[PDB]
Design a protein around this ligand. Structure first.
Ligand SMILES: Cc1cc2nc3c(=O)[nH]c(=O)nc-3n(C[C@H](O)[C@H](O)[C@H](O)COP(=O)(O)O)c2cc1C
Ligand SMILES: Cc1cc2nc3c(=O)[nH]c(=O)nc-3n(C[C@H](O)[C@H](O)[C@H](O)COP(=O)(O)O)c2cc1C
Ligand SMILES: O=c1ccc2cccc(O)c2o1
Ligand SMILES: O=c1ccc2cccc(O)c2o1
Lengths: 360, 360
């Protein structure tokens, strides 16, 4: 099975091609993770996936999506990850982390607590920052503050510090969250970036925050560990061919700047779009990026059907298959997939105290 | 759905009728549990089951099955359970524990490391104790030492101390392991008990260790928390009707002595038997015990098919359905069962960070 072939990137070898993508839990307190996360992550690692990427972890308090988001904006926040990293490694999975800044989509309620911007007089909320003072709209009506050049320098340094902390906590894989309408994506998109300084206008200027942040992170992140990013390569906003062309060009610059793998997604920059949701719908776009930028990729959305994961890999659409919600439903999805695909000794996807009893 | 109706016993209310029965993990060191158990148990509790019974936990070192078994023979061993109990409670499941003594089946290898008695010159092994100096046979050839009356008093006191420790660690449900050919079962069975003192011969004498141990435990175990036992009610050894009749009589004495629920199993006392394994094969025998002893029961073996669990409950064969291996395969089996049975808002079997995203 292609799904169960190992994958090596830099000095890291994943035992199979199943990646658990970042999935926010909304269970942290002032950014500090706790036994929610410890058990959640260790349990997933034991389920058999080759790579487990920790949820969007804010580089700065105001870059959380919600009051429940994880953070890594101090050394104490970083040290809270150490036992979880060690548990993921003990289970034979590779520990990764997505470092993030929510930009104009920050200061929102948890998804089951309204999913919308926090009211102005709620003591939990905060001012958001972005390239330009323009609201997302819809359920995120708050107008962000336009960043100064010093704010740009500060946020870049927060990404650097976050990466240094992730490294020292023992993570073996990092993902910069440049997707999903958050700060990085919003610098790239003309919808959200109306700046007239070095950080907006042209393609080079809109790319600049992302490329400078990648380069700054690269100074502290070990060359022998995968350096990755998530990036929305189109919006489904009626501008798809031009946007894809620019996104592919940016992917080439990321590769030239040391990016080892790209997690290909949708922008979610603005609400007025028509995204054609369906099982593995991103496969063809991920394949195009992979081919035209000559860079390994992953993608997500509906790959929890094992045969579809297998087909994407065999078609060379993807190098890793990211499987999210199916792992919330069943932490042992990798074992289910092994059985479904007829892998020999499928139960030994799991550790011995499970595998022995589930043989045949 | 019957499976998702709450159950109250003494002061304890289970949110549904799904019990996770004790399942040895073989991951402890000198009886001390560790992060294997913490994550395993907390993850199961979050999966939705109403009751989670911790694996056979030895009341004394020599009563472990294997070198990897959990123990509760000192206060330090008990305190290791406290964070796990607290995590099970935080998830809304009821924490239980099975306290045990393996008798002649002790000093064995882990199941994936030979499953047989440990060699005499292996530094990990130890002398086993039992009612009579008679080996199980087959892969467990070691002849145990015949217990003295002082040994009987000591082991009873070890059960008492174990129960007191379980209580003080915060367990809300206790199960005495009088099944599966271990010490208690072996005192009851004429196959293994050839004693000619007060603890063997007659029905009353063979029952005596079990009844005295129950009574001694009852002195320290709170009356407001369920006091339960697992007991093998037949062997499939050609003596089934007579053995069932005696086992039912013992169940009546257990009830009269304060037992709140019986986990009905098979004896496994000797190897030369013909057990008719099949899905829910114990249902009719559990029903007979329930009816003839007028005592709540659970049973196990093949109830991981949700419709079969539901049928057993609706037939009043069982009060709780114990689902073991299906929970090793999928820690979130209760959610799977809720979906399969068409329960409203099935994803809310799980906590919010999962349930929200799995709705519909
Ligand atoms: C609970 C939940 C939280 C998510 N949090 C993040 C996140 O932290 N960062 C991110 O890039 N994507 C996030 N996503 C998107 C997932 O990584 C994934 O791309 C998406 O769920 C589609 O894959 P699936 O169909 O296998 O679930 C999240 C999705 C879910 C369901
Ligand atoms: C891994 C494993 C360990 C077990 N350990 C115990 C135990 O500690 N005590 C016990 O009474 N039964 C033990 N059993 C038996 C289970 O509680 C249960 O009765 C049995 O697995 C049948 O249910 P199932 O078909 O749902 O797995 C164990 C079974 C398994 C699979
Ligand atoms: O696509 C998604 C869905 C949910 C989500 C949640 C947090 C962060 C993200 O980046 C997300 O992306
Ligand atoms: O039926 C079983 C199967 C496995 C097992 C393991 C340990 C203890 C027990 O009591 C057991 O019972």
């Amino acid at each position: 099975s292609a799904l169960f072939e190992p994958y090596t990137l830099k000095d890291v070898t994943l035992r199979n091609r199943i990646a658990i993508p970042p999935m926010c839990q909304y269970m942290a307190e002032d950014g500090m993770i706790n036994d929610w996360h410890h058990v959640h992550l260790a349990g997933l690692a034991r389920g058999g996936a080759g790579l487990l990427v920790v949820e969007a972890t804010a580089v700065a308090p105001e870059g959380r999506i919600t009051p429940g988001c994880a953070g890594i904006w101090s050394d104490a926040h970083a040290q809270a990850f150490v036992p979880v990293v060690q548990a993921i490694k003990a289970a034979g999975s590779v520990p990764g982390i997505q470092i993030a800044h929510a930009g104009r989509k920050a200061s929102a309620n948890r998804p089951w607590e309204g999913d919308d911007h926090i009211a102005a007089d709620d003591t939990r909320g905060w001012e958001t920052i972005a390239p330009s003072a323009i609201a997302f709209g819809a359920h995120l009506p708050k107008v962000p503050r336009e960043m100064t050049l010093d704010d740009i320098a500060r946020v870049k340094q927060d990404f650097v510090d976050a990466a240094r902390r992730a490294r020292d906590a023992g993570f073996e894989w990092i993902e910069l969250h440049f997707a999903h309408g958050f700060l990085g994506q919003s610098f790239f998109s003309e919808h959200s970036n109306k700046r007239t300084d070095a950080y907006g206008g042209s393609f080079d200027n809109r790319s600049r925050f992302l490329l400078e942040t990648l380069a700054a992170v690269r100074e502290v992140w070990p060359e022998n560990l995968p350096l990755t990013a998530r990036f929305g390569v189109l919006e489904y906003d009626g501008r798809d061919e031009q946007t894809l062309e620019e996104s592919i060009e940016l992917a080439r610059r990321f590769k030239a700047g040391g990016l080892d793998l790209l997690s290909v997604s949708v922008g979610f920059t603005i609400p007025d779009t028509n995204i054609p949701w369906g099982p593995a719908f991103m496969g063809p776009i991920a394949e195009r990026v992979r081919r035209e930028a000559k860079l390994p990729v992953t993608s997500a959305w509906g790959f929890g059907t094992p045969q579809l994961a297998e087909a994407a890999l065999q078609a060379n659409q993807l190098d890793l298959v990211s499987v999210g919600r199916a792992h919330l439903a069943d932490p042992h999805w990798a074992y289910f997939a092994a059985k479904e695909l007829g892998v020999e000794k499928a139960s030994w996807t799991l550790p011995a105290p499970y595998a022995h009893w589930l043989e045949r």
